[PDB]
């Protein structure tokens, strides 16, 4: 401590690290408490938070979600009455470069062995990164050669997920899938092959979940409009109404008590375009009380909705 | 009595009209046997009364169907008599003007009543009235019958129907029963405080019948309590009806609330109201109400709707 | 037809028929319509129906339950202004003995032969007779003797149905059994082997149906009180109350929406002599709606009783 | 400024009482430095202001906790400078009833108000009152404070209750501030009209809160609609209150129904009132009725029974 003003110990410098952030850092000494250290990014300051406390030693400022924006030119400048010292550190072009494809590589060796998992679309091959896509351009290898992208077999990426799928899968489908992660100067690949064994057995869950997957859409279904328990003064009428779905339309049918239910000038049922069942009672006599039940069903499914009707005479 | 001279007949069928115009058969028998028959015959065929000088035949409600000869025969071991009683052409045309004789010297004095079409005369026959001749006169004038003013008669009661009644309508009606060569007759003077008071009801009646028939009402389908459980979706429904057509609003918990796209309220062409949560929360649960009115009158049906969470 | 007056063609007299009645019978002859017919019980008439019709040419009156009331003397009298015929036909001591000991074995032959059949109570022995007993004295008849009656075993009757009891049966029980019908003057058999096969077998059910019967009578029980939905204002109170059963007394316990449910300051159960157990929510907020289950069970059988408190804000 | 001549003093420690009887420190220095620092002390121990000739303290709701001895120190590298404003014994005894002064100096003219209790005098300082000399006197002598009687001060008010006032409380009642050798009071005359609407009305909130109270009110248990199905057994019950305990009844359908048998109510200790239902058939459907009501009041709980049949 002097005075004379504070100054640096090392200059500004950056690493990669854990989940490929980007840290920067420095070497602080003489430092007084009311001394001054800001961030600034493009002679822009940074406003993270207080610039009125240190101690030492070492001074770091943490890039994260890291990419081509925080890009461009970094300076802590170390200010108090005393004096100043400025320490700059410059990412620009063939700065940066080095430090994007820097970046990759850390992210690319956190990359877990390729991997098979169907789902209802077709079978997927997946890898994970820890963690992150960016100018980390990617490319795939189907026995060795590139890969004809279309509507039925894409590619693409999420989150920490780098994923090729393969819709409506076949044999012609099977064989040696490799990964082409490019940082920039080196590449990297991580293996697996669609065959046999693993295969039959994708191409199995694959089916059990389309099947499965077609149905649970088309299946009848009540959507809604019936409640669980109606009460009401004996003599007057009641109009209930209950829409359904299904594709085939569906055929509902009702149910009283647990035995079928017969339409009637007194009791009529209506069912309209497949889409609206409509129960109603012209007089609801005390005979007309006990458990009802509404019931679609279609090809893919069946379902239910059951409600009550009680009554009170007045 | 004796062997022989058969049961004889003292006095012939002759006949009489007593009581609520009921027609009697009468004749006096002697030398009568408890191992006797008696028999009645109208136009050559059996009429039974109980089981078979006091005979007695009863004619209910006289008609012309009632017509025929009559014969009253008496028989048995020692001897068989008749009696006829000839009831054909002349000697009928007689009965019916003595029993109608009877009807017209017997009825209430006319009386008004206000209906809610119009304005009424009325008497009581404490008898029957089959092909009796109907005389209204208005002042003195046959009575030109038309859609407005119809005379008749229904069940022991002779009337006169002035609907909607001018002032024009007012003056002495005149009701004249015929039988034959004679005539019994009622009159009544439609004016003044009478009328004063007999118009002044019809229209009562009138005004208020309209709108017992218009006040907006609600007609039917909800319940008086729906209990659902938290989120699936409420379908009520409700028909109405006025003229002019009714307005509606609805209400939950006292208080109007309007319709959302969450917890909608419809009504189309008039005569249907559509209460519609879509989604019912707790917060949706409550105290609802619709009412609907017009110029008429107005009505309001509620309910409520409970839920429970599941 | 004279006259002279009428008369009877054949005097009075008595057969069996069918079920067993009595029906007195005779003949008459010329008869006016006004003919009287009428019959007497001891001089005092028997005020069917009409006496003021006839044609020919027999004369009946059929007694039914037969028994010791209707005997005595029995008179058919004809008259009618002509004349009057009496016919006299007298039902006592050694004339009535008679008739008794004849009906019966009308009774008697319809005697459904001995058959097994087993109750909660023991084993059972019946015949049917079509169709009564009266005064046919009856006996049985277990390998040559009679049997000592008691409360393990008894005789009886039943409408249409005699029987032998045998609660608690055991092997000792096993035998030769024998019916002796007696009617005054014969006797009549009927018999059955309760052994082996038979009897192993009505054992059998025997056993079932007491098991089962000594459950279903100490099952525990819910016997009634609460409802099936209560719908309340939200912050109001409530009690329910819910009477049960059981032998041993039994173990209750509640459910709200299909799991446990425990009681608490707010939500409070509780439970009294083992026969009444008591819901009770002093504030019902919409969370303490759902559906609730009350469940008693002990050693023979378990029973629930469901409802469901729905709830509205004012 | 100038180095040396370390930031002078130019006037030291006094005081003053400003706005809402907060204490204000004052003091005026010089030759300051933005480099300099600003430091206060009470008692040898340090109070932060913010962050360190208008340097100031506020004292918040002065107490006999904020006595002590203060400093304000004023140092750099160039020259240090202390003053002391010493506040214990005398010099301090001077400082509260400067404070009370103030105080007594400014409160609202007493006024009148009716509680459902008693009746109210009361003041309001715009200030605080701590260790402030109390003086209540009815009709120029000191009050015989009883369980009937009592003065004090609540947040802000000062007041002087009279429970179950009589006329005898009636008078001129005084309330002396003493704040040192200084005495402002405030006087006010219970008589006549005020009083005749004072006493008036808390009588009014006195029966009306006896009432509130006792009235019979339904306490809790009822459900407002049950669904059972035909032919189970039905067990409401509710406990209800009172004083003099209520007289209950029942109703089904507006009509008063009475126990019986089949649906049986009972009614024990007076505060439990069991309903009772004992094999619902439709006919025991409907909408009954609880009402308990006493001499103070009423009060009815609905509920509703439907079935449906299985």
Same mark, same amino acid.
């Given at each position: 401590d002097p005075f004379t003003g504070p100054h640096f110990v090392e200059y500004l410098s950056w690493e990669v690290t854990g989940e490929c952030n980007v840290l920067l850092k420095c070497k602080v000494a003489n430092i007084k408490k009311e001394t001054h250290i800001?961030?600034? !990014?493009?002679?822009?300051?940074?406003?993270v938070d207080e610039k009125h406390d240190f101690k030492d030693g070492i001074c770091t400022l943490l890039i994260t979600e890291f990419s081509k924006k925080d890009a461009g030119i970094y300076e802590v400048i170390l200010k108090d009455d005393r004096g100043k010292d400025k320490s700059r550190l410059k990412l620009v072009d063939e700065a940066f470069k080095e430090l994007m494809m820097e970046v990759c590589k850390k992210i690319a060796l956190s990359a @877990?062995?390729? !991997?098979?998992?169907? @789902?209802?679309?077709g079978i997927q091959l997946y890898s994970f990164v820890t963690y992150y896509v960016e100018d980390l351009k990617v490319?795939?290898?189907?026995?060795?050669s590139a890969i004809r992208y279309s509507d039925r077999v894409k590619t693409g990426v999420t989150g920490e997920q780098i994923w090729l799928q393969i819709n409506e899968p076949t044999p012609n489908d099977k064989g040696k899938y490799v990964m082409e992660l490019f940082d920039g100067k080196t590449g990297h690949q991580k293996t697996v092959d669609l065959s046999g064994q693993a295969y039959d057995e994708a191409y199995a869950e694959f089916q059990r979940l389309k099947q499965a997957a077609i149905?649970? !859409?088309?299946?009848a279904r009540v959507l809604g409009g019936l409640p669980d328990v109606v009460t009401i003064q004996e003599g007057k009428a009641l109009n209930l109404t209950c829409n359904v779905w299904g594709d085939p339309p569906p055929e509902v049918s009702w149910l009283k008590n647990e035995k079928a239910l017969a339409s009637d000038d007194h009791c009529n049922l209506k069912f309209e375009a497949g889409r609206t069942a409509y129960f109603t009672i012209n007089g609801v006599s005390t005979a007309d009380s006990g458990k009802y039940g509404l019931?679609? !069903?279609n090809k893919y499914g069946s379902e239910t909705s059951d409600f009550t009707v009680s009554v009170f005479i007045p």
């Open positions: 800001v961030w600034y !990014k493009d002679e822009r300051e940074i406003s @877990t062995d390729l !991997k098979i998992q169907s @789902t209802a679309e490319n795939w290898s189907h026995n060795g149905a649970e !859409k088309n299946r019931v679609v !069903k």
